[PDB]
From a paper:
In this study we showed that the [name] enzyme in crenarchaeote S. acidocaldarius previously annotated as adenylyl cyclase is actually a phosphohydrolase of the TTM family. [name] prefers inorganic triphosphate substrate over NTPs. The general topology of [name] is described by an eight-stranded β-barrel comprising the antiparallel strands β1-β9/β5-β4-β3-β2-β6-β7-β8(-β1) with three interspersing α helices and the C-terminal plug helix α4. The enzyme formed a dimer in solution corresponding to 56 kDa compared with standards.
Initial attempts to produce diffraction quality crystals using apoenzyme were unsuccessful, but crystallization was finally possible under a high-sulfate condition. [name] was crystallized as an open-state homodimer, bound with two sulfate anions instead of the ATP that was included in cocrystallization. The open state of [name] was crystallized in space group P41212 with one monomer per asymmetric unit. The polypeptide is defined by electron density for R6-A176 but lacks completely residues P44-R49 and Q73-R80 due to missing density. The dimerization of [name] was also found in the crystal structure formed by two symmetry mates along the α2 helices and parts of the preceding β5 strand. PDBePISA revealed that the dimer interface covered 875 Å2 with a CSS score of 0.32 and accounts for 8.5% of the total solvent-accessible area of one protomer. The dimerization is mainly established by hydrophobic interactions of residues from β3, β4, β5, and α2 and salt bridges between K99 from one protomer and E81 from the other protomer. The C-terminal α4 plug helix blocks the tunnel entry from one side.
Numbering used by the authors:
A (entry chain A), B (entry chain A): 6 to 44, 46 to 72, 81 to 176
């Protein structure tokens, strides 16, 4: 339903300048994800606990095996402090700056990931995998993008990077 | 700084009717407190984790040995579900309906505690223990209250009741 590409060339700044006039800017998002482990390894039991802050909106999410439960939280640092006082340890942290542009029913996310680099994620609101692929093919062609396609999440890419 | 009295007689309803004209009604509060235990007994280590909902405002609080860390939460049931999915077990629950009245710099709380009964808690904003005591003495005299004085919290009284 989405296509994520690591961008080798050109720069995200360069790519943003080319699509700036013809695309509709949505918003910019600053996001940090803090993952935790209970001292029942999440790696042992396929579970996850994540504190996410997106443009000031803080959410805590439990993920079950292959289920999600989410609550909004007033303060990321205090929730992180409470989790640490209860025995949970900070596992991985993912910091992202995302710029969202829109064209037709496609959302184009220019992602700058700390420690990881530059990515582009393209989403189709109600398109066929084939419709999504044709748009990505033309987008990558139109901007002469050298890419590396991945389906891994940014946490998976961070774990792979470590 | 406060004086809590279990009320034997008369009823809280009766007491409220007597002070209703001369006292200033502040507000009514519906409050539930859910205490948790990690599977590091809170009873072993003198710690506490409490989910409190007061008139719709939900807060999660960690209590340290004899320190408090608090975060506001969007939903009590989802936070309780997240805590349970992480291994925490529900220990005790305290449900209170409180009616707050004001006279001079004294706050009078008519408390109805499920499973426990009726209490009155009187607080002085900036008064001496002696000033607080004289007010409680006259209040208890003026309304012919038969009481039992306690410094125990409602969780302590619930634990004692069980």
């Amino acid at each position: 339903r989405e296509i994520k590409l690591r961008v080798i060339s050109p720069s995200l700044e360069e790519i943003e300048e080319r699509i700036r006039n013809n695309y509709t800017f949505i918003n910019e998002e600053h996001q940090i994800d803090i993952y935790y482990n209970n001292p029942r390894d999440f790696r042992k039991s396929d579970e996850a606990l994540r504190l996410r802050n997106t443009n000031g909106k803080v959410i805590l999410t439990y993920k079950g095996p292959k289920e999600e439960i989410e609550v909004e939280v007033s303060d990321l640092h205090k929730m992180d402090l409470i989790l640490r006082k209860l025995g949970f340890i900070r596992s991985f942290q993912v910091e992202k700056i995302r710029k969202n542009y829109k064209y037709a029913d496609f959302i184009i996310s220019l992602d700058s990931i700390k420690e990881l680099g530059e990515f582009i994620e393209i989403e189709g609101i109600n398109k066929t995998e084939k419709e999504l692929i044709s748009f990505v093919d033309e987008f990558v062609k139109k901007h002469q993008i050298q890419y590396e396609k991945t389906i891994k999440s940014y946490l998976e890419l961070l774990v792979e990077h470590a």
